[PDB]
Amino acid sequence: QALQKYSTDLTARAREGKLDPVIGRDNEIRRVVQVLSRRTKNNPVLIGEPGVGKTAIVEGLAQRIVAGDVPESLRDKTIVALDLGSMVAGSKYRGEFEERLKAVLDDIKNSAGQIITFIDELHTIVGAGATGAMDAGNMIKPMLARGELRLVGATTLDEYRKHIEKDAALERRFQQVYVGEPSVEDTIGILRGLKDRYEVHHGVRITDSALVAAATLSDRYITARFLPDKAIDLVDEAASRLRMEIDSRPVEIDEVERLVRRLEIEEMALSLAKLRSELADQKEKLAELTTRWQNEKNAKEEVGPDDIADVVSAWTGIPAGRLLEGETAKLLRMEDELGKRVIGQKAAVTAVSDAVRRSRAGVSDPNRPTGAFMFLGPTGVGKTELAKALADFLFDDERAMVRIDMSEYGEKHTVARLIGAPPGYVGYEAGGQLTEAVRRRPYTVVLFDEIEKAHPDVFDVLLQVLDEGRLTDGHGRTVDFRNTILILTSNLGSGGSAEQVLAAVRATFKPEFINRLDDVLIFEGLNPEELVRIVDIQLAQLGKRLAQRRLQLQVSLPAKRWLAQRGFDPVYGARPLRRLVQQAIGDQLAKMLLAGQVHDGDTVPVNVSPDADSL
């Protein structure tokens, strides 16, 4: 009678239909029924990596027992789920748990071959009762050998060689049933049967296109779990996305209302102007949308394959939408928009814009990095400027990329600072400097500065990165560089030719490494015309830096071409101009400013006095 008090039941809960319908997996149910009817030692252990369905199999067996596809031996058995957790409730005396478990075993034995026990997560049955001296968990050990209790269990694969293989007298008493995960085509069949329980809990409608999308779209992106269920959660979270909008009123409008309320708060607290404008603008927008809303009303209720993509975009934030109206105007105005920071070198900006546009269009290959290439030329041209320029509109940031340098790697053994240390050695919890920093938010751009100065041993670690985008650290976690962007910089062949530098690449490298790369983009020198448009940007940039004390400048054309005509080196590139500006302006304004008389406010002109320039 203690089974009423210590155990649950899974057959009474099966006659009420309060379990989920179990679809597929005929072979494992047949294997469990095959094992669970032999003469002695009839008790299986379901083993598999977590997620594959091991609790689903036992509930499907309960469904079959109530249904009647069972053999004639297993008729009317009434699976009872024990608890080795809730049976050590109050047992601080030296004999209570022992007789309690003995009373449960005599209650099972006192019923003539009916009860199928079910102990879930049986790796915690070994050290159940600690008597200071092993005397608990080896009370069922003489009983399983004759096979009087049937004992269905389900333990994780890597929880099995930690507790049971440690204590291997018991491991022979159990038969093992391995469970592997299905493929995509069976997940498509599973998801169409669970589209009967999420329509009731959430009163919505679900398109089959969402199922055939999410069964495949989460086979590339969320590469951290296993898949009978990693496609279920996207469906349920998209249903909640829809239910949040079927209730009282939509979303953006909510976004804008909260935002303008915030800016209102801030502004009134300050009473900054500024925000005053951005308020008004945001009030225009929120007005327009509102009207549009009404209009529409005057004139959807189901989920589709776009909401699945938006949910996957909202988590492991790789953008994966249809590219609907948000960035297509920026994706077309992208080559010339990137030309507000890089002057000239059109053939490289085109080859970067191409590799971004074909990635977001969804034309490229699911197992290769989205773009991994190496541009090189002379010094002071803008090869680090371009890599910091395209990390500015993917993110609206400047520092989310992972910039490492290979000028530290002048020796053979330093490779281990980016791959972790093997087990048994000092830094083992720390992992790798690289691999522990890309597994979080896998969309950042990666640079490898100065590939020349590295010793020829780090070249053979990137050799598997560029083609099959996996990498393995010290633990064993396969990180994926599937949809990052890899950029190599160099300095080979500063003034030779367009083919003397191309014969210089092949000397230091091998054919196995040049073949992995995309187009090796040669950078040219500069032009005296194209230098002029550099100078303006310099005189914009410092022109913002003095805005904090609200000084600015009124610079005329003769000074602005005087800066261009001097400091023109075809060798050193556009780097001496950033010294010439602060020699001509910075020391003069430093002497004049901090002795008073250049008060915040009045902007001072500059003009040339025949050699130099003065205020």
Ligand X SMILES: Nc1ncnc2c1ncn2[C@@H]1O[C@H](COP(=O)(O)OP(=O)(O)O)[C@@H](O)[C@H]1O
Place of tokens 């560029």: 466
Tell me the closest approach of the beta carbon of residue 29 to ligand X, in angstroms: 10
Examine residue 545 and tell whether it contacts ligand AGS (CB under 6 A). no
Neighbouring residues of 350: CB distance < 8 A, sequence distance ≥ 6 = 335
DSSP character at residue 404: E
- 183 contact, one of ligand X, a second copy, ligand AGS, none, CB 5-8 Å limit per kind: a second copy
CB of 608 to a second copy, least distance (A): 20
Going by C-alpha positions, the residue among 190, 189, 175, 193 that lies closest to residue 33 is 175
For ligand X, the closer CB: 52 or 356? 52
In the complex, the smallest distance separating the C-beta of residue 586 from a second copy, rounded to whole angstroms, is 5
Residue from 51, 319, 442, 576 binding ligand AGS (CB under 6 A): 51
Confirm or reject binding of residue 381 to ligand AGS (CB under 6 A). Answer: yes
- Going from the C-alpha of 489 to that of each of 344, 381, 462, the distances in angstroms are 18, 12, 14
Is residue 438 close enough to count as binding ligand AGS by CB under 6 A?
A: no
Say how many Å lie between the first and final Cα of the chain, rounded. Answer: 100
Q: How does DSSP assign 228-292, residue by residue? A: TTTTHHHHHHHHHHHHHHHSSS-SHHHHHHHHHHHHHHHHHHH---THHHHHHHHHHHHHHHHHH
51 is a site residue for ligand X (CB under 6 A): yes
**Taking CB under 6 A as the rule, does residue 383 contact ligand AGS?**
yes
Residue 156 near ligand AGS by CB under 6 A: yes
Give me the residues paired with residue 594 across strands.
596
- Decide which of ligand X, ligand AGS, a second copy, none touches 507; Cβ closer than 5 to 8 Å per partner kind: none
- Partner that binds at residue 336, options ligand AGS, a second copy, ligand X, none, CB closer than 5 to 8 Å by kind: none
Are β-strands 371-376 and 402-405 bridged in parallel, bridged antiparallel, or unpaired?
unpaired
Q: For 257, phi and psi rounded to 5 degrees?
A: -65, -45
- One-letter amino acid for residue 122 of the chain: L
CB of 578 to ligand AGS, least distance (A): 6
Piece of 53-61, 255-263, 279-287, 562-570 that binds ligand AGS (CB under 6 A)? 53-61
For residue 445, the cross-strand partners are 485
Helix (H, G, I), strand (E, B) or coil at 563: helix
CA angle, residues 39, 41, 47, in degrees to nearest 5: 130
54 binds ligand AGS (CB under 6 A): yes
Among ligand X, ligand AGS, a second copy, none, what binds residue 264 when CB lies within 5 to 8 Å by partner kind? none
Q: Which of 14, 52, 445, 606 binds ligand X (CB under 6 A)?
A: 52
Which residues, numbered 8-47, are part of the site for ligand X (CB under 6 A)? 20-25
CB 319 within 8 A of CB 360: yes
Residue 333 to residues 338, 340, 396, Cα–Cα distance (Å): 9, 12, 16
- Unique residue bearing structure tokens 């395209």: 390
Q: For residue 386, state whether it binds ligand X (rule: CB under 6 A).
A: no
Tell me how many residues contact ligand X (CB under 6 A).
Answer: 13
Residue 496 per-residue DSSP state: S
> Which of a second copy, ligand X, ligand AGS, none interacts with 340 (beta carbon under 5 to 8 A by kind)?
none
- 430 contact, one of a second copy, ligand AGS, ligand X, none, CB 5-8 Å limit per kind: a second copy
Residues 6+ apart with CB under 8 A from 375: 348, 383, 386, 487, 488, 489, 490, 520, 521, 522, 523
Binding mask 209-228 for ligand AGS (x = CB under 6 A): -------------------x
Query: What string of DSSP letters covers 106-139?
Result: HHHHTSSS---BEEESGGGSTTSS------SS-S
Which string of DSSP letters, residue by residue, matches 566-606?
Answer: SS--TTTTTSTHHHHHIIIIIHHHHHHHBTBSS-SSPPEEE
Q: In the range 160-189, which residues lie near ligand AGS by CB under 6 A?
A: 169, 172
Whole-angstrom distance, CA of residue 519 vs CA of residue 524: 15
Triad 393, 394, 397: Cα angle to 5°: 65
From ligand X, ligand AGS, a second copy, none, interface partner of 162 (C-beta below 5 to 8 A by class): a second copy
State which residue, 306 or 467, has the beta carbon closest to ligand AGS: 467
Pick the binder of ligand X from 44, 53, 153, 420 (CB under 6 A).
Answer: 53
Q: Is 197 in the site for ligand AGS (CB under 6 A)?
A: no
Nearer to ligand AGS, 183 or 607 (CB): 183
CB of residue 83 to ligand X, shortest distance in Å: 15
Our CB check for ligand AGS shows the closer of 133 and 169 to be 169
590 binds, among ligand X, a second copy, ligand AGS, none (CB under 5 to 8 A by kind): a second copy
CB 62 within 8 Å of CB 20: no
Contact partner, 574, from a second copy, ligand X, ligand AGS, none, Cβ < 5-8 Å per class: ligand AGS
CB closer to a second copy, 255 vs 561: 255
Binders of ligand AGS among residues 476 to 505 (CB under 6 A) are: 489, 491
Query: 206-245 mask for ligand X (x: CB under 6 A)?
Result: ----------------------------------------
Positions 548 through 587 that interact with ligand AGS (CB under 6 A): 573-575, 578
CA dist., res. 594 & res. 579, Å (int): 21
- Residue ranges in contact with ligand X by CB under 6 A: 20-25, 50-56
